[PDB]
């Protein structure tokens, strides 16, 4: 049973993803997050090997939750008459990246490099597991403030990774690529790389580069803050208007700006403790 096994705490927030509560596992006081989403509000459904009808986010989470990684792992889930409840890892202490950037402003490039690098490894993990997240953004990244580790959250807009075109998208628009805006068509990896460019800009400028569709499809990148030539170059590359002109994950991680990354722990010691 759900609530004999978990002590529920405060509401952490709610929105399109459902409602998320702090909690602890009673059997060992493991910190968890407990996410409730109503069945009515569930768009995408998939199924587990044993043919149980589950939300797609459960399928995608099971696929990425094997092994250690930069993704918040699904520990358990329950079906209720009108909702599903998901039990997820909870770092403590934790702050999401949107909160973190809002609070502290544009990140020093050393910190942005460590963060961006960890996001790339987490996204590579997802893709290795056949999962495309489709809503990579500051709000979907938790910072473990003591370990200096980033963890991806919210696969509620995700899909199985494929090599053919995607013609659906219910992620965040301002992180969405120009080919989606104007054609309602994108391919998974190149659309991911676009969102990563948006994310890198956000980190080093303290805000996203584009608000309106017109700016997205123009894709002219203006820098409001002092940003290094190498960083500007990588950002402009990720935000190439033609998807085929964007770097692969390998090309990103081999970019001059991405060399000499800090380890998570030393990232925390220097920037977070």
């Amino acid at each position: 049973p759900l609530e004999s096994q978990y002590q529920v705490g405060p509401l952490l927030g709610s929105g399109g993803f459902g409602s998320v509560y702090s909690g602890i596992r009673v059997s060992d006081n493991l910190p968890v997050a407990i996410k409730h989403v109503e069945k009515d509000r569930i768009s995408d459904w998939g199924e587990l090997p044993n043919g149980t009808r589950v939300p797609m986010e459960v399928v995608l989470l099971k696929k990425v939750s094997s092994g250690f990684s930069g993704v918040i792992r699904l520990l358990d889930w329950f079906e209720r008459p009108d909702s599903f409840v998901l039990i997820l890892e909870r770092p403590e202490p934790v702050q999401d990246l949107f909160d973190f950037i809002t609070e502290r402003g544009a990140l020093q490039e050393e910190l942005a490099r460590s963060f961006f690098w960890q996001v790339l490894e987490a996204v590579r993990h997802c893709h290795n597991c056949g999962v495309l997240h489709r809503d990579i953004k500051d709000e979907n990244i938790l910072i473990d403030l003591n370990r200096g580790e980033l963890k991806l959250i919210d696969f509620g807009s995700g899909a199985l990774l494929k090599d053919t075109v995607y013609t659906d998208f219910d992620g965040t628009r301002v992180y969405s690529p120009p080919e989606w805006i104007r054609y309602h068509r994108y391919h998974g990896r190149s659309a991911a790389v676009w969102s990563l460019g948006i994310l890198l800009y956000d980190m080093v400028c303290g805000d996203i580069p584009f608000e309106h569709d017109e700016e997205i499809i123009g894709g002219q990148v203006f820098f409001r803050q002092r940003v290094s030539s190498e960083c500007q170059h990588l950002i402009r590359w990720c935000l190439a208007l033609r998807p085929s002109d964007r770097p692969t994950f390998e090309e990103i991680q081999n970019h001059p700006w991405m060399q000499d990354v800090l380890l998570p722990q030393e990232t925390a010691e220097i920037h977070l403790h």
Side-chain angles (χ1 to χ4, degrees), residues 2 6 52-55 58 62 74-79 84-87:
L2 205 156
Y6 292 102
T52 324
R53 204 202 184 186
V54 288
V58 175
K62 285 180 108 69
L74 178 71
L75 300 182
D76 204 5
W77 63 270
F78 306 86
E79 181 172 357
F84 282 89
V85 186
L86 273 44
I87 309 296

Side-chain angles (χ1 to χ4, degrees), residues 24-35:
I24 53 110
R25 190 160 66 189
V26 304
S27 72
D28 66 335
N29 311 319
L30 175 73
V32 297
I34 302 164
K35 187 173 82 87

Side-chain angles (χ1 to χ4, degrees), residues 11 18 33 54 60 67 72 87 120 135 139 143 147 169 180 188 199:
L11 186 77
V54 288
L60 305 181
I72 291 297
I87 309 296
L120 273 265
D135 193 29
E139 306 171 69
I143 308 162
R147 302 179 63 75
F169 175 77
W180 167 252
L199 179 70

Side-chain angles (χ1 to χ4, degrees), residues 116 119-120 123 136 192-200 238 249 252:
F116 193 60
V119 172
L120 273 265
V123 171
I136 296 160
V193 167
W194 174 276
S195 73
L196 292 162
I198 300 292
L199 179 70
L200 181 50
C238 291
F249 297 131
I252 294 167

